[PDB]
Amino acid sequence: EQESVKEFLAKAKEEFLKKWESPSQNTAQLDHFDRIKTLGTGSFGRVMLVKHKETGNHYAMKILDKQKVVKLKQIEHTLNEKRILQAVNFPFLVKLEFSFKDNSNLYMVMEYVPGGEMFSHLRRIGRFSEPHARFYAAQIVLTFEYLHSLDLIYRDLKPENLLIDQQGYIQVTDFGFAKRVKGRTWTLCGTPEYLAPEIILSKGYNKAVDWWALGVLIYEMAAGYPPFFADQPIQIYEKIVSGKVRFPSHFSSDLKDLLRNLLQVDLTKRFGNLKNGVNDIKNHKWFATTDWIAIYQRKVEAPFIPKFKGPGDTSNFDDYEEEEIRVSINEKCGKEFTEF
Numbered sequence: 531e532q533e534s535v536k537e538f539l540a541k542a543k544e545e546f547l548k549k550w551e552s553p554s555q556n557t558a559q560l561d562h563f564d565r566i567k568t569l570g571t572g573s574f575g576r577v578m579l580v581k582h583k584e585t586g587n588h589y590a591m592k593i594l595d596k597q598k599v600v601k602l603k604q605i606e607h608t609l610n611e612k613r614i615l616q617a618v619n620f621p622f623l624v625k626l627e628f629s630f631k632d633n634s635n636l637y638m639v640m641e642y643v644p645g646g647e648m649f650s651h652l653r654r655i656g657r658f659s660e661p662h663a664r665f666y667a668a669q670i671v672l673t674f675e676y677l678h679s680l681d682l683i684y685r686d687l688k689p690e691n692l693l694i695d696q697q698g699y700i701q702v703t704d705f706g707f708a709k710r711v712k713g714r715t716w717t718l719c720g721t722p723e724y725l726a727p728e729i730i731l732s733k734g735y736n737k738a739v740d741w742w743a744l745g746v747l748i749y750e751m752a753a754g755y756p757p758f759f760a761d762q763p764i765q766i767y768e769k770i771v772s773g774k775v776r777f778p779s780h781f782s783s784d785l786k787d788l789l790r791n792l793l794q795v796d797l798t799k800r801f802g803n804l805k806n807g808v809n810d811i812k813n814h815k816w817f818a819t820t821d822w823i824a825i826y827q828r829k830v831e832a833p834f835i836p837k838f839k840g841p842g843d844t845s846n847f848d849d850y851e852e853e854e855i856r857v858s859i860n861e862k863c864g865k866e867f868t869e870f
């Protein structure tokens with residue numbers, strides 16, 4: 531490994547471990563913010579655009595209902611998410627600014643990324659050219675090199691979880707399945723189209739599942755649709771475990787070669803999981819034009835700058851039913867969330 535990379539990752543791990551061992555807690559409260567608009571929803575709860583009443587700064591506030599987290603069996607995952615987010619620091623990761631809890635809910639207040647989800651831009655344009663896909667892929671490669679060096683598996687890569695910032699760079703969001711793992715882990719989680727075969731087959735799996743998901747993402751960016759597509763999950767799973775994929779004829783030979791090595795069903799042969807680790811990916815011919823240092827330093831001109839009017843603009847996010855943020859007069863699930 532290059533001395534620069536080695537000493538960078540050694541320092542990255544030292545800094546992560548100090549915050550991991552002593553997590554920040556209770557750094558704001560709900561009535562410090564005005565609620566503006568719902569930016570998205572899921573089983574996790576909701577994300578709202580908020581404005582800090584004193585500073586005027588905008589944030590994306592993820593709100594989880596403690597009782598629903600318990601019923602959906604996501605306690606450990608939610609504690610993982612907040613503890614990891616408060617400890618990481620990398621140019622292409624969403625930045626957690628505050629966290630707190632009250633009688634009913636857990637709150638993670640993040641810097642707001644007004645360019646919207648990669649998913650929207652991909653569906654609007656149709657597919658990205660190879661250079662455009664490669665610019666985003668390089669940022670994911672560097673982000674996974676960082677996360678994996680901290681013993682973190684991400685487990686939720688997909689276009690809806692990649693936001694585009696004001697400079698056209700990626701911010702990875704949604705650490706709801708991220709976990710610190712030395713060795714293997716066993717939980718079935720993630721979106722069907724992006725699951726590695728070893729997840730579908732209920733094996734103990736490792737960080738190689740993130741490199742499989744990178745293969746799916748690159749294919750989807752360059753084709754406009756994912757490589758394993760079907761109407762029901764059970765049919766998607768059959769395609770994933772088969773060891774066959776079809777590439778559009780417009781794909782370059784270098785892209786097809788990279789994808790055969792990322793979408794390798796045998797995890798012991800998959801790029802990212804060999805002796806050379808991430809360097810088999812960084813040194814692959816498809817990445818020959820990539821200036822890894824300049825990408826990290828955000829010195830490369832992005833292929834695309836999202837249109838938006840200012841830090842409060844919500845036009846790149848879609849419209850959701852607006853519901854109350856209720857806080858019970860009685861504490862719910864206090865024991866389960868003591869460490870949050």
Ligand SMILES: CC(=O)N1CCN([C@H]2[C@@H]3OC[C@@H](O3)[C@@H](N)[C@@H]2O)CC1
Pocket residue numbers: 569570571572576577590624640641642643644647690691692693703704
């Ligand atoms: C940092 C920022 O600007 N964020 C945080 C994350 N959210 C969520 C929202 O909830 C579900 C859906 O939209 C999801 N794909 C998205 O990542 C968007 C706004």
Ligand SMILES: CC(=O)N1CCN([C@H]2[C@@H]3OC[C@@H](O3)[C@@H](N)[C@@H]2O)CC1
Pocket residue numbers: 851852853
């Ligand atoms: C029956 C149904 O599907 N509904 C009921 C009414 N809502 C409106 C109404 O206006 C303010 C508030 O109730 C909000 N929930 C929403 O916008 C749409 C969803």
